[PDB]
Structure 1
Amino acid sequence: RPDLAWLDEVTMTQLERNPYEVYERLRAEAPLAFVPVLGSYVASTAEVCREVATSPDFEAVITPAGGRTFGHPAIIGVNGDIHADLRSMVEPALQPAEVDRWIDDLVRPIARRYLERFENDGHAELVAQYCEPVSVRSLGDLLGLQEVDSDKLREWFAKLNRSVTNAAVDENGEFANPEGFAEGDQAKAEIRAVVDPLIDKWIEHPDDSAISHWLHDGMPPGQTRDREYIYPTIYVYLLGAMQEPGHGMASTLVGLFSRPEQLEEVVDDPTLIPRAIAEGLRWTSPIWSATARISTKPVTIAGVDLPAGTPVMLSYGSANHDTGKYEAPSQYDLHRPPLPHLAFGAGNHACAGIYFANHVMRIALEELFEAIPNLERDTREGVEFWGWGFRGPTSLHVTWEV
C-alpha cells in the first residue's frame, strides 16, 4: 500500500518500547493495515477490532510466534468442537457464582503474606514484590501448583511472553530472531518436568485443583483428557492468566500516581477500586496485541478487500485509545464515564476469566492501600512500560513515611 510506505521502517523494538505513536497513525491512516515487521494485518481501532472479533466471517487463529510457542490445541487458537470442549473445560472455576464463593479466602491471605514482607520498609518495587507474586500465587494455588514457587511462575510467564511476542519477520516473511523461541522451549521443558508428575497423580487421585478438573470434568467414567490435549491451554494460563492481573494492578497504580488527587480519592474510598482498575486496563491494556482472527471467506473490512485465510492481529491496546470513543485517551482519568472497553477482547473468544481477574486485582489493591495508606511513587525512579503483545510497567518503585 503506497501511502503507508513508512510502515516499512517501523521496527519491532520501536513497537515494544512504545507502540502508541505508530498506532495513532494507523488509527487515522488505515484502521486495518499490513505491518511488515509483524508479517500480518493489524486492526487498530475499536470499530475494526470489535468487528473482526465478533464477525461470523472470522474465526480464531494464533499469532505466528504464539503458535511456534504453544502448539495445538491452544484454547486461543482453535474453533468448533475443540474450542467448545476447551471452553467447557476451563469455565467451571471461572463462573461468577463459583468465584464469589472462595475468591476472598484465596487472594486476601496471599496479599497479606506478600505485604508483610515489606510494608514496614518505607520502600518497595511493587511489580516484583507485590503485583506479580499476588497474581501468580493466587492462580497457581487455584490450578493446583501450590508447590511451584512464585519466583518460578514469574520466570515462566516472562520467558513465555518473550517467545510468544517474538513476532519480527524479515524481508522473506521468516522469523527474524529464531533463537528467541529457545527460552520458550526451555520454559515448556521445565513446566513438563514439574507438571507431568502432578497430572500423573491427579489422574489416579482427583482433587479440587483446577487442572485435576480439566482432566476429569465431563469425561466418561475412568477417563481423563489426554495431557497433550490440555498442555497448550496450560501454557496459555502460565503466560497471560499468570501475568495479566499483576500487570493490570501495576498499570492502574501508575495511572493513579499520575493523578495524585485521584489516588487520594481511591485510598479514602476503596469502593472506587473497581472503577480505577477498569480505567487502568483501558489506559494501558495488559493484553495489548496478543490475539488474532483469520477470515474464513473473502471479506471487506475498513475498505480492505481481504481474501479468505487472512490473519488479522487484534491490537486491543490501540483500540482502547480510540479517539472516536475517548477524550485524551493517553491520560489516566478515574472519572471517565464507564464506557465499554476491549481490554478483555470480544466475541466467542473473549476472555474467559474476567470476573476472577477483576476480583484478584481489586482485592490486591484493597489490601495494599489498607496496609500503606500513605503510599507514594518514588519520583527519583522512572517507570518504563514495555511490550507490544503484552504491555505493562517493568518496575514500580514506591516510598512511604514509616
Structure 2
Amino acid sequence: ERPDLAWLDEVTMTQLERNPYEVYERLRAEAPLAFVPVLGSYVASTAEVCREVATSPDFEAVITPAGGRTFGHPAIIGVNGDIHADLRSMVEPALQPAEVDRWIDDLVRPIARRYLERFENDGHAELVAQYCEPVSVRSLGDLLGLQEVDSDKLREWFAKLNRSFTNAAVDENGEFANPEGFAEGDQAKAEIRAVVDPLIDKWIEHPDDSAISHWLHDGMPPGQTRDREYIYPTIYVYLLGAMQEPGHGMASTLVGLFSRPEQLEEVVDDPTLIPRAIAEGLRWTSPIWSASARISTKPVTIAGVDLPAGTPVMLSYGSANHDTGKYEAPSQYDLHRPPLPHLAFGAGNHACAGIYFANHVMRIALEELFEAIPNLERDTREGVEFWGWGFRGPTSLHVTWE
C-alpha cells in the first residue's frame, strides 16, 4: 500500500530466515516502521522505533499470529493487566538476582563439566549440539523440575516450537501460507503434556523446590494451585525461548570471537572479559531477533506512520541492534565496542524476566569451555551458517584443537 516500498512485496520468508540483514538494512534507512507483506504486519527495524513501541503507554503486549497459534492463552509474552501481573509474580522468584546468586554456580558448572567431559579430549566437536544447547537446556530443565527429561528431548522440543512459532508467512489475504507448519508444534505440545502432566499431578500434592512446583503454589490461597491450563502457555514460553536462547547466545558469542582471533585470545587469557564478550555477542546476533510484538491500544503516530488502534507491530530487536545511528560497523563483532545499551533483552514492562540468570548460564559455560580447551580454534574447513528470523543462531559450530 506504500508505493515507494513496493519492493517489499517481493521479499520472501526464506530470504528473511536465511539472511534478514540486507532487507532490514534497507528498512532502517527507508522505513523504520514498515508493513512487510509476507509477514502481514508492521515491523519496527530501528533502535528508536523498537524502544518507543516497547515502552509506549499506547501499546500493550500481543503475540504474533503464528506465536499465538503455537502457544494459545495466556502466554506471559502476550497478555496484559491483572493476568500479566500474576504471571510475572509467578515466574520472578527464582529469577531474582539475590536468589540466582545462591545456587547458579552449583547448577551450571557441574553441568558444563559433564558435557565437556564427553568430548574435551577428542580434538574436534560441533559445539552447538555437543555443548551450547545441552548446557542451556540442562541448566533450565533442572531449575524447572524437568531433571528426568533428557537434554536431547528438550532440544527437540524447542526446535519444533521454534519452527511453529515463527511459521509467520502469509499470502495475499493475510492467511497463513504454510498451515501444515504448525503440526510439529502441536506434536511437541502433546509430548510435553504427557511428560509434564504427571509431574504437575505430583507437585500439587507434594510441592518441592522446583520452579514449576512454585508456579503452581506461590501466592495462592491455602490448598489451592494455579490451574495447569492457566500455566501451560508460559511453560511453552520457557520450553522455546528460555531453553533455546542462552545456547544461541553463547554460540553466537563464540562465532564472533572466532571472527576476531586476537579478541578470542584476549578472553581466554582474561576470562573476566567473558561478560563483555557475551554482551557484544547478543548485540551482534540477537538470539531473539524478531519474535515479539506489541499492539496499539489507541491511534498513535510512530515514525511518521499514523497507526489506528489495534495495530500489531513486530519488534525486530536483532535489526535494532545493528542500528548505525548507534553503532559503528555493527555487522562486525568487536569485543572492544564502547558499551552501549542494547535491545537483545527487549524493553518496557514485557522486557526479559530472566536476564540475570541467562547471563550467568552463558558466562559460566564459556568460562568452563575456555578452561578445558584453551587452544580452541574454529574448524575453518566448515562454514558457520546462521538461520532464523524470529529466533536466530548458528546451526552448527565446528571447532578443532590440539
- When the two structures are superposed, what TM-score results if normalisation uses the length of structure 1? 1.00
Is 1:338 paired with 2:339? yes
Query: Equivalent residue for 1:163?
Result: 164
Once the 2 structures are TM-superposed, how far is the Cα of residue 255 of structure 1 from its aligned partner? 0.0
Unaligned stretches of 5+ residues in structure 1:
none
Pairs within 5 Å for 1:237-248 = 237-248=238-249
SS of equivalent to 1:326:
coil
Once the 2 structures are TM-superposed, how far is the Cα of residue 133 of structure 1 from its aligned partner? 0.0
Any idea what the Cα deviations from partners look like across 1:199-239, whole Å, max 9, x if unmatched? 00000000000000000000000000000000000000000
Unaligned stretches of 5+ residues in structure 2:
none
Once the 2 structures are TM-superposed, how far is the Cα of residue 198 of structure 1 from its aligned partner? 0.2
Any idea what the Cα deviations from partners look like across 1:109-136, whole Å, max 9, x if unmatched? 0000000000000000000000000000
Once the 2 structures are TM-superposed, how far is the Cα of residue 59 of structure 1 from its aligned partner? 0.0
Pairs within 5 Å for 1:252-267 = 252-267=253-268
C-alpha separation in 2, matches of 1:64 and 1:246: 26
Once the 2 structures are TM-superposed, how far is the Cα of residue 190 of structure 1 from its aligned partner? 0.1
C-alpha separation in 2, matches of 1:325 and 1:91: 31
C-alpha separation in 2, matches of 1:92 and 1:171: 45
SS of equivalent to 1:247:
helix
Any idea what the Cα deviations from partners look like across 1:337-371, whole Å, max 9, x if unmatched? 11000000000000000000000000000000000
Once the 2 structures are TM-superposed, how far is the Cα of residue 269 of structure 1 from its aligned partner? 0.1
Once the 2 structures are TM-superposed, how far is the Cα of residue 300 of structure 1 from its aligned partner? 0.3
Any idea what the Cα deviations from partners look like across 1:133-171, whole Å, max 9, x if unmatched? 000000000000000000000000000000000000001
Any idea what the Cα deviations from partners look like across 1:12-65, whole Å, max 9, x if unmatched? 000000000000000000000000000000000000000000000000000000
C-alpha separation in 1, matches of 2:140 and 2:174: 37
Any idea what the Cα deviations from partners look like across 1:272-293, whole Å, max 9, x if unmatched? 0000000000000000000000
C-alpha separation in 1, matches of 2:102 and 2:339: 27
Any idea what the Cα deviations from partners look like across 1:76-118, whole Å, max 9, x if unmatched? 0000000000000000000000000000000000000000000
C-alpha separation in 2, matches of 1:95 and 1:146: 21
SS of equivalent to 1:313:
strand
Root-mean-square deviation (CA, aligned residues, Å) is 0.2
Kindly report structure 1 stretches of 4+ aligned residues shifted beyond 6 Å: none
Query: Equivalent residue for 1:284?
Result: 285
Any idea what the Cα deviations from partners look like across 1:239-265, whole Å, max 9, x if unmatched? 000000000000000000000000000
Once the 2 structures are TM-superposed, how far is the Cα of residue 331 of structure 1 from its aligned partner? 0.1
SS of equivalent to 1:124:
strand
Any idea what the Cα deviations from partners look like across 1:267-315, whole Å, max 9, x if unmatched? 0000000000000000000000000000000000000000000000000
Query: Equivalent residue for 1:111?
Result: 112
- When the two structures are superposed, what TM-score results if normalisation uses the length of structure 2? 1.00
Equivalenced residue count is: 401
C-alpha separation in 2, matches of 1:251 and 1:276: 10
C-alpha separation in 2, matches of 1:277 and 1:16: 23
SS of equivalent to 1:292:
strand
C-alpha separation in 1, matches of 2:284 and 2:135: 22
